Amino acid sequence: SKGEELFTGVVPILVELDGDVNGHKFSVSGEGEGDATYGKHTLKFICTTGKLPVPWPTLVTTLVQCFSRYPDHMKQHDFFKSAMPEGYVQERTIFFKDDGNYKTRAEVKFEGDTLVNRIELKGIDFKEDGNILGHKLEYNYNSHNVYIMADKQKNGIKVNFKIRHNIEDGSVQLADHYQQNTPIGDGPVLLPDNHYLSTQSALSKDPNEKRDHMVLLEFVTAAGIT
Ligand SMILES: [Mg+2]
Ligand SMILES: [Mg+2]
């Protein structure tokens, strides 16, 4: 189908983020590839401005749900690919419990044969010795369910989920995600029935990289319709 046909093979991915958290300005660039056939993508991210002022794990959700594997019997519910190549706007508010919040605006679209995620991130009202600005988050990542519903009035989707970030003392830092996606182009898109994406993510380091960086391996599969 339109859009989906662009994802049958391996697709290069570029991610570019500019961020400001409590006045700490930074940029991140990522490169990698995705194979939606297998719900798989791999990326390496670099902080191009120096040291990242927030923990890497807090940026994972912000840093391409078009690479999710939609089972054949759910293909009519894949909004993300249906909006391609023109793309979609992905906006979030991320509430860190007992701490500050991120607001993000991204455009995800093809530039030539590459899938590009371009993001502006703004974080405010973080505690200086909270888990975020105090860098108390472990370098790992849990598996989540990402809940999706149609937003027919916006010709898009509404998405909600709760990220669990492990803290170095055994506790959990919750990050409540509220998300909206709307197409950039004016063509038709697939508006889905309620369903979810099951995610899993592995964080690692490149032993040959001296810059502040994150290597990510992610698998995502749509479910919840039988
Ligand atoms: Mg196929
Ligand atoms: Mg633990």
Q: What are phi and psi of 82, to 5 degrees?
A: -60, -25
| Domains contained in the chain, number | 1
CA of 173 to the centre of ligand 2 (A): 12
Q: Which CATH number do you get for residue 53? A: 2.40.155.10
Nearest partner of 27 among 46, 55, 13, judged by Cα = 46
CA of 204 to the centre of ligand 2 (A): 17
220 close to 129: Cβ distance less than 8 angstroms: no
Closest-approaching ligand to the CA atom of 69 = 1
Closest-approaching ligand to the CA atom of 37 = 1
203 close to 140: Cβ distance less than 8 angstroms: yes
Strands 11-21 and 114-124: parallel
Q: Where are the alpha helices (DSSP H) in the chain?
A: 79-82
Radius of gyration of the chain (CA): 17
167 close to 173: Cβ distance less than 8 angstroms: yes
CA of 82 to the centre of ligand 1 (A): 15
127 close to 99: Cβ distance less than 8 angstroms: yes
Domain interval for residue 103: 1-226
Closest-approaching ligand to the CA atom of 172 = 2
CA of 8 to the centre of ligand 1 (A): 6
The partner residues of 45 in beta bridges, in order of sequence, read 30, 214
